[PDB]
């Protein structure tokens, strides 16, 4: 709630809403007679490279399945994430922005993106909503993002990354201090306790 | 182009697109019978505010063409504001971003900024796009919006508010040292280059 407040910017792809998981499900219905990578198994952010190393034109499947009309208003919500957003919105001096990027062909993505938000947030969160490639540029505390590598115009940005776990970042390691979020189970309270005054 | 770039923050509707202009010309042309409001007259911000003023039902009817699909698509650049747009962005240690609030009713309007975008500065300039309702989060050393009022959740922004001249803000009186961009054709690079180091 508003206060300045403590402010969060939470990624969508990969932390509100299951990519990953979206991506498999709908890659197998589709191309049945292809092989995949199981969850458990993927490496690296860009699955389409994974996919690419795989067989010969599997990444140009790959993107088929992004570039399809619901593809991202039908993502699941990751376990805990509508129900740890809708709590973390509603702390004092605590304001959260949800930071996600779209896809570059526009013609589903970002609709998708606000209508996933209306039917999990509800109208009054879509206020909260900022699109931008460029993560950098927006300010703040926190940015808890599964991305390993946030970059951009800035080159100091104000927030913390805090990188959210996902199967592709799972192995990695990171530079002291950053840090980990590693579910929505995880203790997301501290770690936002450890930026207030 | 890229770097830390000076970063500027333009405006779309009112700056880029013209919102008063396209919203009139629809507004004559559903509502034909109805009194309406020359541009010349405009006054605040909030076009249905005067025209619930002017007779009851209008704020409704003028609701319903910003509502419309192909309201945003179909809006025509303010002149000179693509050429110098463009010429900003190839400007050496100079990043330029969109930064662009849409309305509540996202059915139409964040696709159509982004096929606005595409047809009139290309693919590339795609990745430029920041769609928030909240520029305060946003940083920069400028900000070029024809809203007098920019407020949000950061209560100093990075940026100088630079006015971009409308009918609805023309006459105002702005605080020193806030000042205004008249017009595209107006010294935009002089306001850059007093940011510069
Ligand atoms: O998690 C992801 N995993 C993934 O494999 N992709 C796919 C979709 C498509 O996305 C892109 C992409 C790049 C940068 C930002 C957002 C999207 P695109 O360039 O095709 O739009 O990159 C190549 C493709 O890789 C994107 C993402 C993007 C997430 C957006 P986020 O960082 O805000 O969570
Ligand atoms: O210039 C405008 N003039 C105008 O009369 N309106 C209308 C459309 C609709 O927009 C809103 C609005 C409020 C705040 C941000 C963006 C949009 P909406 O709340 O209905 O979405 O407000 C009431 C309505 O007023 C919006 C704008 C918005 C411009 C967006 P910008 O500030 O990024 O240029
Ligand atoms: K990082
Ligand atoms: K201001
Ligand atoms: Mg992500
Ligand atoms: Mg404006």
Not at 82 to 105: G, H, R, W, Y
Not at 124 to 139: A, M, N
Not at 154 to 173: I, K, R
Request: proline fraction near 7%.
């Amino acid at each position: 709630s508003n206060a300045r407040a403590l402010r969060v910017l939470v990624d969508m792809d990969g932390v509100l809403a299951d990519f990953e998981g979206g991506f498999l499900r709908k890659f197998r219905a589709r191309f049945p007679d292809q092989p995949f990578i199981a969850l458990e198994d993927r490496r690296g952010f860009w699955v389409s490279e994974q996919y690419g190393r795989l067989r010969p034109g599997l990444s140009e499947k790959a993107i088929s399945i992004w570039e399809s009309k619901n593809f991202f208003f039908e993502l699941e919500p990751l376990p805990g994430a509508v129900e740890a957003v809708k709590e973390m919105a509603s702390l004092q001096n605590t304001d959260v922005f949800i930071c996600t990027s779209p896809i570059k062909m526009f013609k589903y993505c970002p609709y998708e993106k606000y209508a996933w938000v209306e039917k999990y947030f509800g109208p009054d969160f879509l206020e909260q909503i900022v699109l931008t490639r460029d993560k950098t540029v927006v300010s703040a505390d926190l940015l808890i993002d599964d991305r390993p590598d946030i970059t951009g115009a800035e080159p100091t940005p104000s927030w913390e990354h805090v990188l959210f776990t996902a199967c592709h970042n799972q192995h990695l390691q990171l530079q002291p201090p950053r840090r980990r979020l590693h579910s929505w189970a995880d203790d997301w309270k501290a770690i936002l306790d450890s930026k207030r005054p």
